[PDB]
Amino acid sequence: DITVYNGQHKEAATAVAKAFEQETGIKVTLNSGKSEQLAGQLKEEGDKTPADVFYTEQTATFADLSEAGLLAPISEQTIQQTAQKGVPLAPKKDWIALSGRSRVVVYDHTKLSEKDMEKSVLDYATPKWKGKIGYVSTSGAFLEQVVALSKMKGDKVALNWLKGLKENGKLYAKNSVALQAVENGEVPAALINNYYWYNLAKEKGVENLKSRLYFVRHQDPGALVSYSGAAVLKASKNQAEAQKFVDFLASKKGQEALVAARAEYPLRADVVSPFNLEPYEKLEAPVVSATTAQDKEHAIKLIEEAGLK
Amino acid sequence: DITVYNGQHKEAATAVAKAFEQETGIKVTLNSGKSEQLAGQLKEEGDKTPADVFYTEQTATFADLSEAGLLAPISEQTIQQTAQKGVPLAPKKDWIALSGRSRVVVYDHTKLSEKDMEKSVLDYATPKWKGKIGYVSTSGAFLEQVVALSKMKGDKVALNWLKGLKENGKLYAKNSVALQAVENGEVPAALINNYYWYNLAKEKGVENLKSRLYFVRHQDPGALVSYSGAAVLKASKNQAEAQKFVDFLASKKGQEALVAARAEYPLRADVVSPFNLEPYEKLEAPVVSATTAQDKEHAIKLIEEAGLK
Ligand SMILES: [Fe+3]
Ligand SMILES: [Fe+3]
């Protein structure tokens, strides 16, 4: 049996866990929490951690752990299975990307049309959007967005964008809350990840939603796709089973289990999401290098500088 | 007017040069030679080089130059244009990949069928292939193959493969010569890059060729796609024009010019090669990280160790 530190949304974890149990008879115990505290805790437990696997919303969360040598290597053959355009590869083969989440703009289509949308994510952080654009600065994908800005456009552009959000945007604690804020009409638009919308649409029927998704495309930084993944703890006592679980998540059955439950992009070529996602290729997402521990600290620095935290 | 140090096959360079001149009225002077000597020479000339642009068969050739800060940065927007699955991105935005070349096995179809081919590139380096498999150890893509082996399979596997080639394979000075050796029946099969074959087929008619291509697929290291690219010299006096030339090579018209002449894969999504190449996606090529200067030295070391050089 194995213990999974779960930084993914609960519905994602349960779905793959149940499937795995069903397929193999290995029981999975989930210890759920926010991707960051979890990463922190693993550093602190070191070789005494009870965790076997760490499953998180953002591969960027693996940077520190990998640098400190806390993660075990995966087979190259597994890694190759989810290697698609834009997907980061762990330099030490000690973590794997498994699903993609797109940055999107959600907006109230009963107040706006595509026609009112911007051609760049940069443009939302302006007075023109004063108190009209929601954002989530504590979001993991928000930080990746910052790193992407900095790498694609440079620090000044990035900083300006942050300062702009601070002055003009409405801050929400979580992506889900931001999405609700649009539906409830608190704000007309918000920057979040794609999956929340589709998920909400399935529960409620798109016909009943005020909100719709807008894709920035044309390789803008705001077209960023970031990835969720997993890693095996070097400290694990149950290597056979831990490895088996990570491999399963990269298999056709594990990808199917995940995509059925959550509107994230599968990374295997032979799996179709049932959610009718906007086709990857049409996203025109830019390719960005993997976020390193140093990239991470740097983005944090900018956020602070802009006075966001 | 600009001066291009040309490490690409002459027919590639001329074709893009002519096109560029035609489109812009800027004259291009080509100084042709082998990608390595050229790279060496640029190091040696430093800030006194007369080169404006360096155009080469293998992006790996840029590693040293970039490390020494000899290359100028390109626009991120240009870089994004050729960023496809598997394509390496320059960490300092100071070089760009422009076309892909696949590793392939060519074989005499009047002596063998696919059925006699191997499922892995590893298997050709065996006694079963004694004096029956041609290889080119001085080839730029050969070195990349070595790096890929080492990164995917580890050093021992790599070394074994090299030693195997040494004992069992027939060595040729160049890819073209290897290809001819198959046609002339000196060897039944050889490891080269895809473009030579297609090019030969167009001049001569496939119906007149003994040789055919075999793709290893399934993410084997022998399914490697490596890339040709260009860079602007930091020392250039003609930056405006040099940059314009690199941007042109990444444009639709520059990619078209190239693919018309040479059977390499375009990297832009809106360009179709007229050569009827095996579709990229069907190659099942593995994704490998960019070759660093250090990777390069390491591969050289293995080659030596195996007694190849
Ligand atoms: Fe989330
Ligand atoms: Fe060549």
GROMACS .gro file of C-alpha atoms in nm, chain B residues 86-240:
model
  155
  395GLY     CA    1   1.144   1.795  -2.968
  396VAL     CA    2   1.306   2.125  -3.079
  397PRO     CA    3   1.574   2.264  -2.850
  398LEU     CA    4   1.551   2.630  -2.735
  399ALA     CA    5   1.869   2.831  -2.677
  400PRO     CA    6   1.888   2.923  -2.312
  401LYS     CA    7   2.023   3.270  -2.395
  402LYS     CA    8   1.799   3.326  -2.698
  403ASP     CA    9   2.117   3.349  -2.909
  404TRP     CA   10   2.054   3.074  -3.170
  405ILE     CA   11   1.752   2.923  -3.343
  406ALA     CA   12   1.662   2.583  -3.476
  407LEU     CA   13   1.528   2.592  -3.830
  408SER     CA   14   1.499   2.250  -3.983
  409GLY     CA   15   1.489   1.885  -3.870
  410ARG     CA   16   1.693   1.588  -3.993
  411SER     CA   17   1.589   1.234  -3.888
  412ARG     CA   18   1.814   0.951  -3.813
  413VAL     CA   19   1.714   0.658  -4.037
  414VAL     CA   20   1.833   0.323  -4.150
  415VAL     CA   21   1.878   0.295  -4.524
  416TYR     CA   22   1.882  -0.042  -4.672
  417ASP     CA   23   1.900  -0.231  -5.000
  418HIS     CA   24   1.545  -0.348  -5.059
  419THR     CA   25   1.671  -0.594  -5.308
  420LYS     CA   26   1.843  -0.775  -5.036
  421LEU     CA   27   1.624  -0.705  -4.735
  422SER     CA   28   1.282  -0.608  -4.629
  423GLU     CA   29   1.153  -0.424  -4.324
  424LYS     CA   30   1.114  -0.764  -4.186
  425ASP     CA   31   1.490  -0.796  -4.161
  426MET     CA   32   1.527  -0.463  -3.979
  427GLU     CA   33   1.583  -0.419  -3.604
  428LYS     CA   34   1.341  -0.277  -3.347
  429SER     CA   35   1.620  -0.077  -3.188
  430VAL     CA   36   1.924   0.108  -3.309
  431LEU     CA   37   2.111  -0.088  -3.045
  432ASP     CA   38   2.064  -0.415  -3.229
  433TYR     CA   39   2.260  -0.315  -3.538
  434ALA     CA   40   2.579  -0.305  -3.354
  435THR     CA   41   2.605  -0.677  -3.324
  436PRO     CA   42   2.785  -0.963  -3.483
  437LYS     CA   43   2.471  -1.046  -3.654
  438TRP     CA   44   2.554  -0.733  -3.856
  439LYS     CA   45   2.911  -0.812  -3.904
  440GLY     CA   46   3.051  -0.604  -4.186
  441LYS     CA   47   2.692  -0.528  -4.296
  442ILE     CA   48   2.612  -0.194  -4.139
  443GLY     CA   49   2.768   0.132  -4.244
  444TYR     CA   50   2.822   0.423  -4.008
  445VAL     CA   51   2.988   0.767  -4.009
  446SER     CA   52   3.163   0.849  -3.690
  447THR     CA   53   3.269   1.196  -3.793
  448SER     CA   54   2.911   1.298  -3.875
  449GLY     CA   55   2.758   1.574  -3.671
  450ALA     CA   56   2.433   1.385  -3.629
  451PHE     CA   57   2.633   1.075  -3.530
  452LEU     CA   58   2.765   1.265  -3.228
  453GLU     CA   59   2.417   1.377  -3.139
  454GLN     CA   60   2.307   1.013  -3.159
  455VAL     CA   61   2.578   0.929  -2.905
  456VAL     CA   62   2.465   1.208  -2.673
  457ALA     CA   63   2.105   1.086  -2.707
  458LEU     CA   64   2.215   0.729  -2.622
  459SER     CA   65   2.402   0.842  -2.323
  460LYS     CA   66   2.116   1.057  -2.193
  461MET     CA   67   1.841   0.796  -2.261
  462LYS     CA   68   2.016   0.472  -2.184
  463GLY     CA   69   2.326   0.568  -1.988
  464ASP     CA   70   2.697   0.545  -2.057
  465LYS     CA   71   2.740   0.175  -2.047
  466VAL     CA   72   2.477   0.113  -2.307
  467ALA     CA   73   2.621   0.384  -2.517
  468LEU     CA   74   2.976   0.258  -2.493
  469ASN     CA   75   2.871  -0.091  -2.576
  470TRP     CA   76   2.700   0.034  -2.884
  471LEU     CA   77   3.009   0.217  -2.992
  472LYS     CA   78   3.234  -0.075  -2.937
  473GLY     CA   79   2.992  -0.286  -3.128
  474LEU     CA   80   3.008  -0.058  -3.426
  475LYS     CA   81   3.374  -0.060  -3.417
  476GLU     CA   82   3.390  -0.432  -3.425
  477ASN     CA   83   3.103  -0.497  -3.665
  478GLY     CA   84   3.033  -0.194  -3.870
  479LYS     CA   85   3.185  -0.050  -4.186
  480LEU     CA   86   3.306   0.305  -4.148
  481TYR     CA   87   3.251   0.571  -4.416
  482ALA     CA   88   3.378   0.923  -4.430
  483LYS     CA   89   3.045   1.093  -4.496
  484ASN     CA   90   2.678   1.024  -4.500
  485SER     CA   91   2.667   1.066  -4.877
  486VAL     CA   92   2.935   0.807  -4.930
  487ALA     CA   93   2.756   0.571  -4.697
  488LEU     CA   94   2.444   0.612  -4.898
  489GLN     CA   95   2.629   0.544  -5.219
  490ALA     CA   96   2.785   0.236  -5.063
  491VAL     CA   97   2.438   0.090  -5.023
  492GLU     CA   98   2.336   0.173  -5.375
  493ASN     CA   99   2.661   0.019  -5.511
  494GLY     CA  100   2.603  -0.283  -5.292
  495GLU     CA  101   2.909  -0.252  -5.073
  496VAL     CA  102   2.685  -0.279  -4.767
  497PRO     CA  103   2.332  -0.368  -4.731
  498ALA     CA  104   2.245  -0.099  -4.482
  499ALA     CA  105   2.379   0.221  -4.319
  500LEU     CA  106   2.287   0.467  -4.045
  501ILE     CA  107   2.252   0.823  -4.194
  502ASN     CA  108   2.009   1.119  -4.193
  503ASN     CA  109   1.687   1.116  -4.392
  504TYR     CA  110   1.747   1.399  -4.631
  505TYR     CA  111   2.023   1.245  -4.837
  506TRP     CA  112   1.790   0.967  -4.953
  507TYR     CA  113   1.502   1.176  -5.058
  508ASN     CA  114   1.732   1.407  -5.231
  509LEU     CA  115   1.890   1.124  -5.422
  510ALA     CA  116   1.545   0.983  -5.503
  511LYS     CA  117   1.440   1.306  -5.661
  512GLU     CA  118   1.735   1.326  -5.887
  513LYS     CA  119   1.718   0.965  -5.989
  514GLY     CA  120   1.364   0.835  -5.947
  515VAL     CA  121   1.285   0.599  -5.664
  516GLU     CA  122   1.215   0.333  -5.910
  517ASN     CA  123   1.578   0.341  -5.999
  518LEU     CA  124   1.709   0.315  -5.642
  519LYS     CA  125   1.804  -0.009  -5.466
  520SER     CA  126   1.780   0.177  -5.133
  521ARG     CA  127   1.488   0.244  -4.915
  522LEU     CA  128   1.441   0.408  -4.571
  523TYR     CA  129   1.355   0.230  -4.247
  524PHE     CA  130   1.224   0.428  -3.942
  525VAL     CA  131   1.291   0.268  -3.603
  526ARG     CA  132   1.016   0.460  -3.430
  527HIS     CA  133   0.873   0.390  -3.080
  528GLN     CA  134   1.080   0.652  -2.916
  529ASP     CA  135   1.397   0.455  -2.970
  530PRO     CA  136   1.719   0.660  -2.956
  531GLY     CA  137   1.763   0.557  -3.319
  532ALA     CA  138   1.444   0.757  -3.400
  533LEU     CA  139   1.626   1.079  -3.300
  534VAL     CA  140   1.547   1.400  -3.494
  535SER     CA  141   1.835   1.659  -3.465
  536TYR     CA  142   1.818   2.015  -3.593
  537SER     CA  143   2.000   2.255  -3.820
  538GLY     CA  144   1.992   2.627  -3.723
  539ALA     CA  145   2.158   2.968  -3.741
  540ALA     CA  146   2.294   3.240  -3.516
  541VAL     CA  147   2.404   3.607  -3.551
  542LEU     CA  148   2.764   3.685  -3.444
  543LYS     CA  149   2.789   3.934  -3.159
  544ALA     CA  150   3.086   4.085  -3.348
  545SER     CA  151   2.879   4.160  -3.664
  546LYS     CA  152   2.890   4.501  -3.804
  547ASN     CA  153   2.574   4.448  -3.998
  548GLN     CA  154   2.327   4.364  -3.722
  549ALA     CA  155   2.019   4.495  -3.897
   0.00000   0.00000   0.00000
